[PDB]
Design a protein around this ligand. Structure first.
Ligand SMILES: N[C@@H](CCC(=O)O)C(=O)O
Ligand SMILES: [Zn+2]
Ligand SMILES: [Zn+2]
Length: 259
């Protein structure tokens, strides 16, 4: 038994730097839902692990011209990591290069606006141009719009790919920031789980409108032919049945009525 390298990513409340991370070392520098999930999964698969923040800070997308993966998916495909424990969305194209456990949490694409903005749904965004909108750069949200042929989404993608300045953001925070300072002239498309978290914390200036654009899940990913495959799925399954994943979700998303 060799130390397992866990690639993950900074995204609240999945993985956050502890308040005193400066005086801490290793896996102790972090906290969050996925930090807790990793300890559980590790304990049930009987392995010691090392939490490693993805080098390029991305989830993963296959380059159009080079067909080479970046982000966490790439860490996995190119042997730089043994397993990904993060809010990584299970999608068809990712399933062709890596393997996923059964999902551990659900979500769907959603819309974030600054309170006051006149937008209630994706359709509203598609038939107007005053209010700009975009998504996280190399993630599944972006790939949902790029690949969609549904009229409204297709129309949203056509505008997004050519807007100026670029409507895509390097990180979630960046996107959330853009909404807050853009006086309502920028709406952000991100996953519901993350939308709900922001929406209920200070400054309470944003909100989620409309229903989710689709439905999917987050899964623990491993390289093709990994030896952890069965063990993590059994682990994720057990955790599901015991109701641990829900309790865990309820803890990290616990709302202080802040808003
Ligand atoms: N969960 C997404 C990243 C977030 C997003 O694209 O909105 C992924 O695995 O790519
Ligand atoms: Zn710090
Ligand atoms: Zn346990």
């Amino acid at each position: 038994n060799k130390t397992v390298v866990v690639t993950t990513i900074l995204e609240s409340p999945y993985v956050m730097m502890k308040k005193n991370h400066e005086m801490l070392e290793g896996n102790e520098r972090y906290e969050g839902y996925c930090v807790d999930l990793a300890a559980e999964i590790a304990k049930h698969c009987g392995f010691k692990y090392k939490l490693t923040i993805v080098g390029d800070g991305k989830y993963g997308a296959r380059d159009a011209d080079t067909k080479i993966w970046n982000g966490m998916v790439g860490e996995l495909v190119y042997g730089k990591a043994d397993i990904a424990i993060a809010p990584l969305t299970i999608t068809l194209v990712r399933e062709e290069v890596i393997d996923f456990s059964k999902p551990f949490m659900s979500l769907g694409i959603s819309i974030m606006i600054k309170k006051g903005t006149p937008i209630e749904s994706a359709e509203d965004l598609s038939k107007q141009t005053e209010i700009a909108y975009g998504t996280l750069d190399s993630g599944s949200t972006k790939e949902f719009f790029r690949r969609s042929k549904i009229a409204v989404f297709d129309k949203m993608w056509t505008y997004m790919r050519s807007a100026e300045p670029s409507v895509f953001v390097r990180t979630t925070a960046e996107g959330v920031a853009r909404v807050r300072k853009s006086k309502g002239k920028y709406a952000y498309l991100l996953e519901s789980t993350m939308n709900e978290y922001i929406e209920q914390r200070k400054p309470c200036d944003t909100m989620k409108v409309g229903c989710n654009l689709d439905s999917k899940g987050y899964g623990i990913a491993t390289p093709k032919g990994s030896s952890l495959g069965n063990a993590v799925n059994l682990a994720v399954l057990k955790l599901n049945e015991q109701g641990l994943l829900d309790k865990l979700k309820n803890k990290w998303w616990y709302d202080k009525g802040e808003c």
